[PDB]
Design a protein around this ligand. Structure first.
Ligand code: THP
Ligand code: CA
Length: 129
């Protein structure tokens, strides 16, 4: 897998973000995670977390997996990095997302993320509190 450039257009919520990729605006859905919706518990906190990570980043990068790159809604499916740190993983690690939506063939970082979830759960963080 390969990291590719992109620039923030705007934060949306816990697990979606508007980025410019190859010069075109796209909504990205984070692979392998599920954040609460803004109106649900920890929804606002997920959104804020993602927002901060991406707004403070100097270098946003997009990493596609081996499978489908767009979902049925036209959202790009990727791992997103903010100054080299994966937002997908950081959400999980903080108990602000659950590992979810693990489809065969777009699941390269599954075990990395499940390790983060296990630590978040041990620490009883946020969702796991
Ligand atoms: C994360 C992800 C979601 N989706 C689809 C499955 C879900 O369909 P449904 O809308 O039919 O539930 C929806 C979940 O996204 P959200 O959690 O953003 O709603 O997006 C994929 O198809 N592939 C993926 O990798
Ligand atoms: Ca969601």
């Amino acid at each position: 897998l390969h990291k590719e450039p992109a620039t923030l257009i705007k934060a949306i919520d816990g697990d979606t973000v508007k980025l410019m990729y190859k010069g075109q605006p796209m909504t990205f859905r984070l692979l392998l995670v599920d954040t609460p919706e803004f109106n649900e518990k920890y929804g606002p906190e997920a959104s804020a977390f993602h927002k901060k990570m991406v707004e403070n980043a100097k270098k946003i990068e997009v990493e596609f997996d081996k499978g489908q790159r767009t979902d049925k809604y036209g959202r790009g499916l990727a791992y997103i990095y903010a100054d080299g740190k994966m937002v997908n993983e950081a959400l999980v690690r903080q108990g602000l997302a659950k590992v979810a939506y693990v489809y065969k063939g777009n699941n390269t970082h599954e075990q990395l993320l499940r390790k983060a979830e296990a630590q978040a759960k041990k620490e009883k963080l946020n969702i796991w509190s």
